[PDB]
Amino acid sequence: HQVKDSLEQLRCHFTWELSIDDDEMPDLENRVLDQIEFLDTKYSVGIHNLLAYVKHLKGQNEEALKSLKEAENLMQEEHDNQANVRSLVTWGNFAWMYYHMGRLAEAQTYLDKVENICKKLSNPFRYRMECPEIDCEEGWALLKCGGKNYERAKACFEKVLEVDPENPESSAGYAISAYRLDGFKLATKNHKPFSLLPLRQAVRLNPDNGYIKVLLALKLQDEGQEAEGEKYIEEALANMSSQTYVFRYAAKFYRRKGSVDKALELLKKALQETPTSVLLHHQIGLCYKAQMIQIKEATKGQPRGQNREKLDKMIRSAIFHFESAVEKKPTFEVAHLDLARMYIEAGNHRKAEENFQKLLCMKPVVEETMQDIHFHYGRFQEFQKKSDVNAIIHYLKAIKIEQASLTRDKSINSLKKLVLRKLRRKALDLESLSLLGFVYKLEGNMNEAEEYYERAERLA
């Protein structure tokens, strides 16, 4: 069992516990292909090795070898024929591939190549190479393979920065990881911008990286500094580096600023390049949603004639794009939520219900998203289905997810309003009395709360 034990010591995709879910594999493959074609970075070894690992997981071992060979061919050019330690990721993935294919003599050849380099560099381990380049490669792999991996990704880049605080590559990976982790918490009470300083430093150290600049812009916009952010949007848009990705985030920036037409123009250009992007399809849908709201506001909710034809175009176009996003990535929870909400605007309550029911069964990486799912389903039950019983159930389920947030507070307020309404129609509704006590208790008004709980008890 010497071979297998040696393979487990290698640092490469096979030993990084990426845990790629089958339902996310088609989207991952498309994102990997998009990145190969459109992300401008110095070394593309990592991304080709991830494509090989994906092909392996698909049962296409011969196709996987092709991607590992391409990774070696490209390394020759990106380092000018010179030796580079990132090759050890490729060689580790060859050893695993050949082991899985039964080409065991070749698997041993690649273990020997790795060992030879670990010796040459005075690495303490025989097969496990300890160098910052490989910590970064582990981090980028994790960062590409979904939100559940982002704490691990950040820690890979942080390990490099603890020894070399001005390392450009790990500064970039740390900042992007941190930005996405901040995104997960953006609606939680008293959230803080942990990623802002990392992004400033990553831009300083990677001055040609437009991708990092547009994330810095968006975090500045989050923090109420939109004009400073817009300067970075403009600098990124003047750069060709990773242009199509720059367009995605500039489009988000302009939509949030209120320039929805500008956002749509950028997204339509980006969709020409990466038409399978679920991020693009969701962003385009949000733009049509924003335009729908603008039409509603100008016509006081009663568009007619051409304005009605325009509203319906916005609704149907948003449904098309949200449906496109969730076809491609069925685990994209918030896109299903936007879709359910847009089916309410289209007057299709059965399709809204269907998507809410799907959402109730999901297990988001971001557990607080289920507050939003219950809250919006509760509102649908209250206002479209005229079911106070089911509205109460789902406002309570939102509240029971204790994390303080904008939506938990809205759920408390919505439950309060519903119960106050019921009590006007029937002041001796014991259930409503107790719920109103519960609401006051959650608000901290302990005397009002016990008053209502007591009143409810007396009746019974």
Place this chain on the structure above:
RNA sequence: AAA
């Protein structure tokens, strides 16, 4: 990637 909603918020």
